[PDB]
Amino acid sequence: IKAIAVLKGDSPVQGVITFTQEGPVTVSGEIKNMDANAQRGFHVHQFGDNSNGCTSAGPHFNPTGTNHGDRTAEVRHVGDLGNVKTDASGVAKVQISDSQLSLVGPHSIIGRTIVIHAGEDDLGKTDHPESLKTGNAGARSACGVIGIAA
Amino acid sequence: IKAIAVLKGDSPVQGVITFTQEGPVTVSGEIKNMDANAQRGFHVHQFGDNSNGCTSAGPHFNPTGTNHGDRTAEVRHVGDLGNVKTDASGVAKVQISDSQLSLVGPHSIIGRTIVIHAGEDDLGKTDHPESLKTGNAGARSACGVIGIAA
Numbered sequence: 387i388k389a390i391a392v393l394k395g396d397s398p399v400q401g402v403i404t405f406t407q408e409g410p411v412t413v414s415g416e417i418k419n420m421d422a423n424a425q426r427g428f429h430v431h432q433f434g435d436n437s438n439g440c441t442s443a444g445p446h447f448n449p450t451g452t453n454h455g456d457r458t459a460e461v462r463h464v465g466d467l468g469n470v471k472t473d474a475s476g477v478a479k480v481q482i483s484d485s486q487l488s489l490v491g492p493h494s495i496i497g498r499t500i501v502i503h504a505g506e507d508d509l510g511k512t513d514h515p516e517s518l519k520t521g522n523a524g525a526r527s528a529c530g531v532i533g534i535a536a
Numbered sequence: 537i538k539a540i541a542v543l544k545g546d547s548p549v550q551g552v553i554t555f556t557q558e559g560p561v562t563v564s565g566e567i568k569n570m571d572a573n574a575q576r577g578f579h580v581h582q583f584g585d586n587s588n589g590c591t592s593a594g595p596h597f598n599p600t601g602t603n604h605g606d607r608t609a610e611v612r613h614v615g616d617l618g619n620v621k622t623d624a625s626g627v628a629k630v631q632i633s634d635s636q637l638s639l640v641g642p643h644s645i646i647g648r649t650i651v652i653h654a655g656e657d658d659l660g661k662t663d664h665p666e667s668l669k670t671g672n673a674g675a676r677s678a679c680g681v682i683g684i685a686a
């Protein structure tokens with residue numbers, strides 16, 4: 387099973403992310419025009435609504451009704467993919483295998499939005515009021531609706 | 537249940553289409569910058585893949601494995617929404633109630649693509665080799681991935 391998203395937003399950041407699944411989902415692709423040598427929050431948001439740009443994507447995809455965390459944490463939203471790393475050229479070469487994402491069933495991310503943020507995800511580990519909501523990762527630099535691919 | 541798509545392409549045509557369902561799906565919205573006083577083919581295509589613009593959307597969404605027809609015809613693809621009409625200003629005010637579309641289940645269009653074409657859909661009623669495939673409606677002026685909305 388395959389899905390894909392084309393990310394764009396109110397910023398120069400752009401990329402293409404693929405999702406494949408036989409089991410874990412493999413997330414891959416390149417996101418460009420980001421800050422160099424950085425860590426940036428990467429999350430599946432609930433709605434595939436791009437009518438108000440990335441803002442209409444809503445909160446993190448959270449079908450289990452829990453709080454925000456790192457991708458590897460015990461407590462995390464299904465949509466929490468942690469921070470991705472950019473190189474000196476501002477490119478994030480995304481490569482993630484995640485067992486909470488799915489492309490089928492009740493936890494499917496098809497028709498939702500993948501978002502790359504302007505800041506680092508704080509992993510739900512601060513006293514900031516957005517920490518347990520979103521990781522306080524700042525603006526949504528780019529996003530794309532997750533669609534079924536061939 | 538609600539879904540939404542933002543349509544853009546390699547043309548000036550742009551719009552926002554909503555889909556609502558309790559039963560039939562109601563399709564509504566405005567598509568702008570089209571030719572004036574025209575009829576233009578409007579279809580759900582199989583893939584929500586915008587990585588090669590509208591071209592990567594693939595063929596008409598066709599889970600029942602049949603041939604192309606008008607929205608009201610006996611023989612039609614599930615994705616066949618016929619022609620929409622534009623006014624003198626090049627605006628299509630889309631308003632359709634369709635019983636073959638769905639936002640849930642095996643025939644769900646979530647994560648697929650809605651496409652507006654540059655030409656009239658021939659309704660599967662000509663000898664053109666694309667008639668039974670697509671209605672020979674010409675270029676894909678704009679398209680959008682269909683996402684879950686609030």
Ligand SMILES: [Cu+2]
Pocket residue numbers: 427428429431446501503520523
């Ligand atoms: Cu986010």
Ligand SMILES: [Cu+2]
Pocket residue numbers: 577578579581596651653670673
């Ligand atoms: Cu078409």
Ligand SMILES: [Zn+2]
Pocket residue numbers: 429446453454455462463465466519520521
């Ligand atoms: Zn989260």
Ligand SMILES: [Zn+2]
Pocket residue numbers: 579596603604605612613615616669670671
């Ligand atoms: Zn068709």
